[PDB]
Amino acid sequence: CRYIPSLPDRILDAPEIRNDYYLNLVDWSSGNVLAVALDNSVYLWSASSGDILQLLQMEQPGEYISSVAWIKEGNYLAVGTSSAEVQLWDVQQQKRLRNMTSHSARVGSLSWNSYILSSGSRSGHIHHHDVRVAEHHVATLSGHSQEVCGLRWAPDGRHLASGGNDNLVNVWPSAPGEGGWVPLQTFTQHQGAVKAVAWCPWQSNVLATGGGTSDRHIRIWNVCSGACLSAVDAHSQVCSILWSPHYKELISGHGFAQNQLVIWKYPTMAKVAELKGHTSRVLSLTMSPDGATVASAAADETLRLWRCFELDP
């Protein structure tokens, strides 16, 4: 009965998207708005109306946007920059509320946990920002020696996962514990950059990660035991992973040679579908609020919107 279209339903132009693997340039809000960073500008596109807002453009020569992330309610957008800023924007008013500095290099990854915004940098450091207070920088988590390219709070707020260009995955506690701010787990088995980081929505302690060109694997972990539950050879760079509770599946994005997305059944990890259409490496995936559509951003200067998880009547 399942019908998964083999082509995207819609394609959005992404002219001048920066083909830098480590950046996290797209996010789909709970209000059904895609934020897309294109060189030195952020554009918002409503999936309901097709309306567009050029939210902002950087003001200095050479500056570019290095990450975007919507707050839970979809009314504020965090924007990390090449100038090591973490900006907070009110999107309806189109106004910059904060321009937070603390990092020493570009901010390529972001993840929210309520009013805490966590930022990852090319420096290897992760900062927690309490966006409500004057001195926003409230913690530093230092577990990477290369760029933090994946950063993701668990849905239940109990862990934060990070992936780096040092081929490490760290699982961090949600607050200092008996060991201060040291990782609860550090997984070294990926042999390439770990940009893909995503938590299972129906298993609190289960994490998926994916490695780059020199690794090509998806790994599933229990972050409490530290066990690798499954290691799957995807035969291609793994830039991004999402989970879907509609049929209990995972979807991953990839690069050379097929530049495809793969849908996997969970927990068996059997391949369900391959979504071909991008003509250069996929960079990032993000999920619609209703869970039916995945947007993939790629180096071919498109976002492809795949209606691949619909619950058809």
UniProtKB/Swiss-Prot annotation:
Disulfide links within the chain: none
Residues of the full protein shown: 165 to 477 of 499
Record's keyword annotation contains NAD: no
Protein name: Cell division cycle protein 20 homolog
Compartments where found: Cytoplasm, Cytoskeleton, Microtubule organizing center, Centrosome; Chromosome, Centromere, Kinetochore; Cytoplasm, Cytoskeleton, Spindle pole
PTM field: Acetylated.
Gene: CDC20
Record-level GO BP terms: anaphase-promoting complex-dependent catabolic process; cell differentiation; cell division; metaphase/anaphase transition of cell cycle; metaphase/anaphase transition of meiosis I; mitotic sister chromatid cohesion; mitotic spindle assembly; mitotic spindle assembly checkpoint signaling
Impact reported for L275R: In OZEMA14; uncertain significance; decreased function in metaphase/anaphase transition of meiosis I; does not fully rescue metaphase I arrest in CDC20-knocked down mouse oocytes; decreased function in positive regulation of anaphase-promoting complex-dependent catabolic process; shows normal kinetochore localization
Pathway(s) this gene product operates in, as recorded in its UniProt entry: Protein modification; protein ubiquitination
Disease: Oocyte/zygote/embryo maturation arrest 14: An autosomal recessive female infertility disorder characterized by oocyte maturation arrest, fertilization failure, and/or early embryonic arrest.
Consequence of changing W221C: In OZEMA14; decreased function in metaphase/anaphase transition of meiosis I; does not fully rescue metaphase I arrest in CDC20-knocked down mouse oocytes; slightly decreased function in positive regulation of anaphase-promoting complex-dependent catabolic process; shows normal kinetochore localization
WD repeats, residue ranges: 18-57, 60-99, 102-139, 143-182, 189-231, 233-274, 277-313
